[PDB]
Amino acid sequence: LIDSKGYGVGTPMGSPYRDKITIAILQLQEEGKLHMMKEKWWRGNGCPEEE
Amino acid sequence: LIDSKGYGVGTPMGSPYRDKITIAILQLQEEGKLHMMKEKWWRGNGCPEEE
Amino acid sequence: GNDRFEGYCIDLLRELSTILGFTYEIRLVEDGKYGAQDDVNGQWNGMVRELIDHKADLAVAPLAITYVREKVIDFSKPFMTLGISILYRKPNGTNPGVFSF
Amino acid sequence: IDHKADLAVAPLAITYVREKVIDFSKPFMTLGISILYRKPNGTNPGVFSF
Ligand SMILES: CCCCCCCC/C=C/CCCCCCCC(=O)O[C@@H](COC(=O)CCCCCCCCCCCCCCC)COP(=O)([O-])OCC[N+](C)(C)C
Ligand SMILES: CCCCCCCC/C=C\CCCCCCCC(=O)O[C@@H](COC(=O)CCCCCCCCCCCCCCC)COP(=O)([O-])OCC[N+](C)(C)C
Ligand SMILES: O=S1(=O)NCN(C2CC2)c2ccc(F)cc21
Ligand SMILES: O=S1(=O)NCN(C2CC2)c2ccc(F)cc21
Ligand SMILES: C=C(C)[C@H]1CN[C@H](C(=O)O)[C@H]1CC(=O)O
Numbered sequence: 001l002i003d004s005k006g007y008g009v010g011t012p013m014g015s016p017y018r019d020k021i022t023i024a025i026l027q028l029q030e031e032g033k034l035h036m037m038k039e040k041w042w043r044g045n046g047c048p049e050e051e
Numbered sequence: 052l053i054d055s056k057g058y059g060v061g062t063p064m065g066s067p068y069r070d071k072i073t074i075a076i077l078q079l080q081e082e083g084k085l086h087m088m089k090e091k092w093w094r095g096n097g098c099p100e101e102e
Numbered sequence: 103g104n105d106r107f108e109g110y111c112i113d114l115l116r117e118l119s120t121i122l123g124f125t126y127e128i129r130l131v132e133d134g135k136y137g138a139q140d141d142v143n144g145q146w147n148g149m150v151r152e153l154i155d156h157k158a159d160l161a162v163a164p165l166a167i168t169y170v171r172e173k174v175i176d177f178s179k180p181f182m183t184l185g186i187s188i189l190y191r192k193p194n195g196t197n198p199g200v201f202s203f
Numbered sequence: 204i205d206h207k208a209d210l211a212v213a214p215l216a217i218t219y220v221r222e223k224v225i226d227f228s229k230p231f232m233t234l235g236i237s238i239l240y241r242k243p244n245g246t247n248p249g250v251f252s253f
């Protein structure tokens with residue numbers, strides 16, 4: 001990886017939902033929900049070998 | 052990695068130094084200073100004895 | 103309505119809904135774009151732009167945390183972790199024949 | 204919380220219950236919980252492998 005960055009539910013400048021969503025992202029990350037969803041969509045079909 | 056979570060400069064709940072370091076941490080990253088400081092400390096005698 | 107769409111960031115927006123309760127409506131960005139200053143005007147484009155003049159409230163999409171995007175709009179704390187990296191072709195199968203000796 | 208300081212510049216990992224009392228900046232370093240264990244010494248039996 002050249003750099004490191006990340007996503008985010010973007011809100012307008014000074015919106016109240018900057019705080020009520022990061023409570024519900026940190027909650028969904030410790031419950032494993034943000035890894036069950038990544039696994040459900042990035043599962044692909046598999047590549048055979050890296051020998 | 053079991054989960055994924057990160058560090059962060061902690062501010063009191065309501066402090067405006069939250070947002071002024073939010074932009075400031077992003078400022079060192081795209082310049083490559085956060086990678087440069089981490090390179091300087093987490094790299095040492097590499098245990099190269101594999102060969 | 104909200105049933106035309108599926109994906110990671112539609113599953114995320116449903117899971118943020120059952121926690122908060124804000125029942126949403128998808129209006130996808132029209133001039134499809136993320137955000138950039140046009141370097142002569144200074145105006146933003148797309149989903150950074152439609153959050154500035156308060157046309158919609160969220161940006162549930164791969165809208166990366168960029169130093170120039172953070173000064174203008176308010177990002178939440180991340181839900182994935184990116185990195186710029188190179189997509190090139192895997193090399194050929196070398197195929198050592200049965201008469202390789 | 205009780206304002207005896209202004210910042211917390213330290214390895215203070217962002218947790219759900221810490222975010223509900225103080226407010227963090229955006230991460231300057233990424234990690235995850237991972238298991239540390241002794242590198243195994245010695246090799247396989249391998250009386251074959253001719
Ligand atoms: C080419 C030039 C010479 C040709 C000459 C004749 C060729 C004729 C055929 C010769 C060999 C016969 C078939 C061998 C099959 C074994 C497969 C294998 O890879 O091991 C497998 C099973 O291996 C075993 O553990 C047990 C195998 C049999 C034990 C006795 C060897 C037979 C030698 C016969 C004496 C000759 C008598 C007949 C002639 C007088 C996997 O187990 P491992 O890998 O062993 O596990 C240890 C290694 N490790 C711990 C690192 C993992
Ligand atoms: C039997 C006599 C007959 C007369 C003939 C005389 C001729 C002379 C022949 C040979 C002369 C010299 C032989 C000595 C070689 C062994 C060396 C040794 O002791 O150390 C090794 C013993 O590991 C072995 O090799 C065990 C050998 C036992 C022999 C009997 C087994 C089969 C019996 C019949 C089978 C069924 C029969 C059914 C047939 C179909 C261990 O070494 P180590 O230091 O502990 O290292 C461990 C490695 N590690 C740490 C990586 C794990
Ligand atoms: O854009 S950020 O909020 N700050 C920069 N970083 C860390 C410095 C690598 C990271 C690392 C992972 C992210 F998901 C977000 C960010
Ligand atoms: O705790 S966070 O602020 N939000 C959750 N995440 C991503 C879900 C992995 C990440 C990923 C990398 C980070 F550095 C921080 C966080
Ligand atoms: C050394 C300590 C107690 C710190 C290191 N960072 C973790 C934290 O940020 O809470 C703590 C626990 C750990 O190492 O698992």
Ligand SMILES: *[C@@H]1O[C@H](CO)[C@@H](O)[C@H](O)[C@H]1NC(C)=O
Nearest residue numbers: 190191192193194195196197
């Ligand atoms: C082998 O490589 C050539 C060019 O490098 C490419 O055109 C061809 O499709 C490849 N064949 C494969 C990947 O089977």
